[PDB]
Amino acid sequence: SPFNISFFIYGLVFLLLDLEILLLYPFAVSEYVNSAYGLAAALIFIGIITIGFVYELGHDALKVHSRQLKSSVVISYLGNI
Amino acid sequence: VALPKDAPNPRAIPREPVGEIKQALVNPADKYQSKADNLHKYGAWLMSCLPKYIQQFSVWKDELTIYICPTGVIPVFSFLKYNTNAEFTQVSDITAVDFPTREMRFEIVYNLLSVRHNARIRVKTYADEVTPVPSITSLYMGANWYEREVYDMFGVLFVGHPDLRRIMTDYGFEGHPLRKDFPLTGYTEIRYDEEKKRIVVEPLELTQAFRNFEGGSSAWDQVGPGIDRTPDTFKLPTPKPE
Amino acid sequence: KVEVYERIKSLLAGFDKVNDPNNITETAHFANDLGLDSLDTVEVVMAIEEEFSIEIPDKDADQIHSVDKAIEYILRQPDA
Amino acid sequence: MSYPTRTLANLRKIGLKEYFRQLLYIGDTKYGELVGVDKFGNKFYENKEELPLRTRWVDYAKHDYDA
Amino acid sequence: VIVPYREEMAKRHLKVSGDLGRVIFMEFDLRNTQSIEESVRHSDVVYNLIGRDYPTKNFSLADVHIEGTERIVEAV
Amino acid sequence: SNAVSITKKYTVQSTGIWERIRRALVIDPNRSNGVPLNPYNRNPSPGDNPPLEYTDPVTIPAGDIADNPYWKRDFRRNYPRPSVIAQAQQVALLSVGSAAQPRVELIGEEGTKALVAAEEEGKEKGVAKYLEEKGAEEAKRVLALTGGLPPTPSGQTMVTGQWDVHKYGLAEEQSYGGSYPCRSFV
Amino acid sequence: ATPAGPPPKNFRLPPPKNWDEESESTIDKVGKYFLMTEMLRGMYVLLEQFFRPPYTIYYPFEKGPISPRFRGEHALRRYPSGEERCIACKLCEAVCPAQAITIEAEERADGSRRTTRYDIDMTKCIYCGFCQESCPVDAIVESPNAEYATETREELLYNKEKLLANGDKWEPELAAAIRADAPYR
Amino acid sequence: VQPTKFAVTVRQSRNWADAKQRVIAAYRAWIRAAPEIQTMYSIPFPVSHIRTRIRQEFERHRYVNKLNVVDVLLQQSNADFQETMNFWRQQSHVMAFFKEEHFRGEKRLPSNFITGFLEGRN
Amino acid sequence: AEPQDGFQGTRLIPTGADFQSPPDPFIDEGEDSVEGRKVRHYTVNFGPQHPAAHGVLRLILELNGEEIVRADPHVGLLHRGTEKLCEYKTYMQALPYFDRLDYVSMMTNEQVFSLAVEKLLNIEIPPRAKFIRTMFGEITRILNHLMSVLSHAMDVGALTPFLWGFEEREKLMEFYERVSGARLHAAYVRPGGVHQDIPVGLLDDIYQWATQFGDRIDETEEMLTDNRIWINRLKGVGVVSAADALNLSFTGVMLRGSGVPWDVRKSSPYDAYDQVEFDVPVGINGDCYDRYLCRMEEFRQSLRIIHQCLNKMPAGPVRYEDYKITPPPRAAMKENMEALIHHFLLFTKGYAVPPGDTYTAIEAPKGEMGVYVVSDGSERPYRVHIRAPGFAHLSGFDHITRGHLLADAVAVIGTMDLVFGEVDR
Amino acid sequence: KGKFLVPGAPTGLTGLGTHPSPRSALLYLYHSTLEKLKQIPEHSVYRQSVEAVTRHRLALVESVVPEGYDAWVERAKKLLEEHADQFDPTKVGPEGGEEVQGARAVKVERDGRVFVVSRLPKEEDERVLEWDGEVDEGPELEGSRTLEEKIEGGLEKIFTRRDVKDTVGRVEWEPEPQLTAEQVAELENKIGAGLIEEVIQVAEGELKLVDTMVKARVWEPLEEQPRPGQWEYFERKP
Amino acid sequence: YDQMPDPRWVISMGSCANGGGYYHYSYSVVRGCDRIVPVDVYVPGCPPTSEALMYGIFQLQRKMRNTKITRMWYRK
Ligand SMILES: *P(=O)(O)OCC(C)(C)[C@H](O)C(=O)NCCC(=O)NCCSC(=O)CCCCCCCCCCCCC
Ligand code: SF4
Ligand code: SF4
Ligand code: SF4
């Protein structure tokens, strides 16, 4: 039977987001020398990866909206011919 | 134990004495005569509206039964579903009764409910071992399993039924257990066989045979013929003297 | 084709309901010539369907009543 | 579920030997008045300040107690 | 069927074969003569299926086969 | 308020310092703990209810020794027989009316034979053929029996004194109020 | 759906309310969402139960309550003299909904109407008390006993010997249960 | 079809020509499914032995000359076919259909008078 | 001229297909392209061996990934041939067979068979029996809802309310054992009334339990009603419209959850329900959450009825006073000739029931329970057919679940009050 | 505010929404019923019964008039004559046309009275609609195609489909005024058969019933006599 | 039952599981589960009380407590 693409998305977004968190761990153990200048680049890096998460959320690759009485007919009486 | 201040012992309150209890004698059938005329009129109007299929109707206490020929099953139930004065939009129950003394041995019984009118109606038709009945699955979704039960227990075919299969008996079960000629313990029984390493069907063998005390039925009739309660509006007039 | 007929003999001659072997022809009929009743015929077409590994529709199967009719029918079907 | 004050009191009324023996069969610290003894040697006790349905209980004569 | 057994959990499947009261279990040791002949005195046929391909701490091949049969056959 | 006082709820209460602790910490101090009281609950045990106190009651019409003949209260043997109407009977009921309301005079002779004519006609032609010969006026007559309009099915409750539908209406007190999607009907 | 007659007063719901029209402040709405207020309240309920007395009794050292009417293991009873109460009427064999009773009877050596076979198949019996209700002499009764699970099914095929022994052992309970409930029977 | 895998709506046959097509159609589906039936219930018999049983079942009713009775037999065949091709039957049910696998044999009736008499009514 | 007319097949009988009317089109609202590619479904068996929500349930589902395509419940795993056995029993002997159909709702099960037999007997039961049966009816409704709601809660993960509420079950099972001698199968309600009168201290013991039961309901609502996990598991799940619920044969809460105000106790009153006051909870969205809220409110109305029955309990006999139908008191049977004969005949032959047939329905805890009895005039019923609400409800499982998530199936199995003794009988 | 009920608003019965134009729907159904019953003989009680209930309910529906109905009717009648090609089903089809992004409207004739059925694009969020709701029939067939596959791709639709903005020769259909919420309640209080939405449901079913009754000819002699003993139970002889 | 790892036991609880019960004469009922699986303890009652079930579980525990495992192999 066919498999669900949501499983690939969970692993894909986990891996890519796991890499970005890894890349921020050096900053947390270097904050004092980095000071303001290193913080700018970290914030630039965070801002860029945040936009890809917005893409993740906006397109709902995890199927956020997976599960979900206006009448098209209106009738008018005109009477006898 | 720590008792509640305002909860005294309810056994400790003495009860007022009771003396000569008087209860009037009630015939429970009397309360339905108020509607006996209306039930006959409704049955008569149905017979007038569908004379081609309605053979007779009967009123017992507050229950109206309609007797129809098998071919009219779809037209009659359509009328009971959709007519503005008959909005029996639910099938309470479908079942069968076996009468071997009849040529059409199977009596098919439908019980309907009209929530709008707060009313119930009974529709009876008949069938045979080889004479099918129209399925009412196209008018009532709930009817699907009831007709499978009738087919399982009685062997009655419902033409137009989708997926008419057994619902109660085991797969590969032979016979229709609610037939009067089907014996109580049936024909076969199962066990686990240690050579075949699986369950096996075998001819039925009872360590103690069933004891039927039907012969103890009273040698005298115990109920009698009963009472006629047909309303006057449905009894024929009588010629006056002279 | 001729390769189909040599396979046709491989099953009809092996069939145990034939009145007499070597009675098969290029246009022999199961009923008149080979003495096959209704269901024996149903079985023969089912054995041919297995040989060519192609399922035969019930209407098409009713059309098939002779050795030639089967030889013609299998050729039309792409699978073999 | 004894609670501290209940168990501490019953310990004082019964002693540690009896306490540990009771902990070996019933798994609780119970104390009450001896209602009587049956033919088999079971001892029956009552205490009306216990929880409902726990006001009567038996101390079985036999180690392999059976109901 | 009288079934003389050694381990209770081993013989549990045999009871399913018969109706109530048909498969009867008897605790037995091949060196307990009372047990062998209590299992046999009512029977009209006795099957000896006792064998072992290996010797054990408690039974040599001669102890289980020769001495085993000899006690059973004498009971028969 | 909704809650009844804990002091009236037949459960073991707290006392002293522990009741003040309980009233200070729990979500609702009026809520019981479900432990029944041993002096009041099943006390005495039903096996020690004095047997002499209970009296087996007898209602004096059914249980008198003087004025109750069995046949007057034999309501089982007075069971109603089912009232059966076939197509022949309805044609007769349409041709000559009923005993509550006849169609013609039917006075003695020439009416007894006239009445049996309405029976054999009902047997021969059913309701449909009868109506077809007589025409649309007979059809209006069938509905004239029910007052012009076709009848309505009888109701199954007699609380108001007549058989009718039960008049479901919203209860003046909504248990959930309006905060939940469930409405109380009385 | 609705009963015949005019629509029930106010049966029709008012139109749905938009987000804009909700009569609940944002701070409360945001606070409950992020703080999980109703889940915290449910957890607090468990702590209240954590400090309430448990309902557990320590069986088999303590027992749950049973009534004089309780239907358990069957027994055959005697008169105070020791004569059997049973006179082979077969009322219990006839009324039995499960056909669990089998009886045979003749005249005893002294000419008394007594049973020769009185079996109850405890693996057929539905424990309904119909035999005890039908008995005109209080011969068949259900004892309060319920703790008689057996190793084999054959041990649950009670003959007359097993049932009369049960009555001999349980008689003081049997008389006490009859004493308490006979006024209601 | 629509309700479940092999579900066939109950219909009467219009005429004897209509009935014969269904009977041949029913036989064709049965003997075609015989290879699958073997491997699906692990039957210890060859497809030849299974297919013979299919023909005999159809031959018990070869002499029926009543249209209503045929409709009943056709409905039974469809019901048995569905509950077989769907794995609703168990190996015990299908194996019980083969009369050889009863420990008293398949010749469960006496051969003649004297064998049944000597054994005691069979 | 059937069935020889069918020997050569003339005049085929008309089906529902022959009456399909085309919709009015004016007002009717209803290459290797990858869109033509088929999708293979996998068919999964659920039960009875592999654990399911509850009971002997083989649920065969065709799935499309996570979504339900077709739902095919196989029942009969508890079909015991109850309806056939009743034809070999007297009416007395058939009564215990009704305890074992919906076997958490024993007294109302035996209530429906008693009312049907009383109707054919043409007897009016004494007022005290009517109030006892109504009182035990609402005690049995609470016992059922405690089992249904809480085990439904336990299936979706909420362990604790099941523990709390089954102590309430223990308290109410004591009342069943005090009146009869059984925790479950009381055989207490019989045609003619009830077996024996209630012991002289029972009403006060019921009253004491009644003063504390409201708190038990409230603490259950503390864990579920506002809980966002509970709401997210139930809201919008298992929706059925009011129109389809009627056409699917849905009764009780499965019908009232979709907005239809209908209770058999109101529409066709029986016993003492016309003498008591109570409200009928009705939902509006027809989902599992509405049906949960209706059942929680039914707890409170049941307690409200029980309190009224405690105060309105009249004095008098509990069995109809004709020894030709009900057994005489044991003291009468040992005292006078007439009573002993009537005792002998009722326990060997049984009472004769006038011939005829009736369909009698009650509002059982799981919905409309009905029984259809045919009497032939003898002491054994000719035919007993039982209408179980769970049978109709489970027949609608495909309709309510098709197109929805497999992860919502446990919610709707629990929203139907499903005991398979009812379903299979 | 609450003067007019909101179409699609839940009524209370699950799956039963508030009706868009309930009064005209009842008139359409009732008149469609009387016309469909004209093919039944006059001696059929079934026909006599449905007539009595429908003409009685019809009289009550006419007894409640939307405010300003007379003003609307004159223009609406005036609009049909001058633009008959825009509303005749024989030209635009029973659905009003293949354009769903636009408004459709069809004149129809029942029981001597004329009705206009209208269809409107569903109110959908602009963030989610593509090309203003125009139906996606895939892409066109590019490349080297035969004539046959071109015709199978609806190439002739190029010469007959209309751009949604293109309204030069056609006119905007104006809806009938609606009954107020007060008027709906008092009308259904007159009918006494539940909510207006339920009454419409019963009318739709009753309209469906006529076709079955005519096809079954339920007014003719009994189809099959009950053979002797067919309905004989165990009743004792009186 | 076949999928249960050893050591394993079966408790038949109730008249129906024991010998068929109220449905012993039914066409669709097995007259006791011991026709299908071997049973270690039979608990009587229809239904047995919760205490009666507990008593049977105690009997099976006493059965386990008296089971000889290392001494059974040591005998032979
Ligand atoms: P040919 O001329 O030889 O025969 C053609 C027929 C059969 C039509 C006859 O000539 C004929 O006229 N017959 C009269 C009508 C008729 O055919 N009767 C209908 C019978 S249908 C039938 O018998 C269905 C039985 C199906 C059984 C299948 C096998 C059993 C199920 C288990 C399978 C094995 C275990 C999994
Ligand atoms: S036990 Fe009682 S009812 Fe049964 S035979 Fe003996 S005396 Fe008669
Ligand atoms: S208790 Fe009921 S089932 Fe058991 S023997 Fe007595 S009458 Fe028969
Ligand atoms: S309670 Fe009685 S009927 Fe129910 S399962 Fe147990 S033994 Fe069978």
PDB file of C-alpha atoms in Angstrom, chain E residues 6-9 12-13 15-16 19-20 28-29 31 56-59, chain K residues 6-9 34-38 40 63 68 72-76:
ATOM      1  CA  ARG E   6       5.259 -37.047  36.205  1.00  0.00           C
ATOM      2  CA  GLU E   7       4.962 -33.285  35.425  1.00  0.00           C
ATOM      3  CA  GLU E   8       1.404 -31.808  35.850  1.00  0.00           C
ATOM      4  CA  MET E   9       1.932 -28.915  33.415  1.00  0.00           C
ATOM      5  CA  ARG E  12      -2.562 -30.603  30.443  1.00  0.00           C
ATOM      6  CA  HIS E  13      -3.286 -30.900  26.632  1.00  0.00           C
ATOM      7  CA  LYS E  15      -7.638 -33.757  28.852  1.00  0.00           C
ATOM      8  CA  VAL E  16      -9.149 -31.992  25.824  1.00  0.00           C
ATOM      9  CA  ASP E  19     -15.542 -36.161  27.438  1.00  0.00           C
ATOM     10  CA  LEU E  20     -15.873 -35.511  31.161  1.00  0.00           C
ATOM     11  CA  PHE E  28       3.332 -42.005  39.020  1.00  0.00           C
ATOM     12  CA  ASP E  29       7.019 -42.798  39.243  1.00  0.00           C
ATOM     13  CA  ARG E  31      10.147 -46.788  40.622  1.00  0.00           C
ATOM     14  CA  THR E  56      20.064 -39.322  32.870  1.00  0.00           C
ATOM     15  CA  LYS E  57      21.359 -38.860  36.398  1.00  0.00           C
ATOM     16  CA  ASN E  58      18.361 -40.846  37.663  1.00  0.00           C
ATOM     17  CA  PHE E  59      17.837 -43.387  34.858  1.00  0.00           C
TER      18      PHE E  59
ATOM     19  CA  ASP K   6       4.981 -20.706  28.824  1.00  0.00           C
ATOM     20  CA  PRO K   7       4.421 -20.981  31.698  1.00  0.00           C
ATOM     21  CA  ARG K   8       0.718 -20.382  31.074  1.00  0.00           C
ATOM     22  CA  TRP K   9      -2.612 -21.189  32.698  1.00  0.00           C
ATOM     23  CA  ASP K  34     -12.448 -27.173  27.915  1.00  0.00           C
ATOM     24  CA  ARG K  35     -13.521 -28.616  24.558  1.00  0.00           C
ATOM     25  CA  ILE K  36     -11.120 -26.062  23.040  1.00  0.00           C
ATOM     26  CA  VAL K  37      -8.377 -25.311  25.598  1.00  0.00           C
ATOM     27  CA  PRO K  38      -7.139 -27.092  28.746  1.00  0.00           C
ATOM     28  CA  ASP K  40      -6.564 -25.158  35.232  1.00  0.00           C
ATOM     29  CA  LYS K  63      -1.356 -24.239  42.530  1.00  0.00           C
ATOM     30  CA  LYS K  68       7.654 -28.409  41.605  1.00  0.00           C
ATOM     31  CA  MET K  72      10.659 -32.215  39.170  1.00  0.00           C
ATOM     32  CA  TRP K  73      13.707 -32.258  36.901  1.00  0.00           C
ATOM     33  CA  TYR K  74      15.741 -33.502  39.870  1.00  0.00           C
ATOM     34  CA  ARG K  75      13.447 -36.515  40.301  1.00  0.00           C
ATOM     35  CA  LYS K  76      13.843 -37.320  36.593  1.00  0.00           C
TER      36      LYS K  76
END
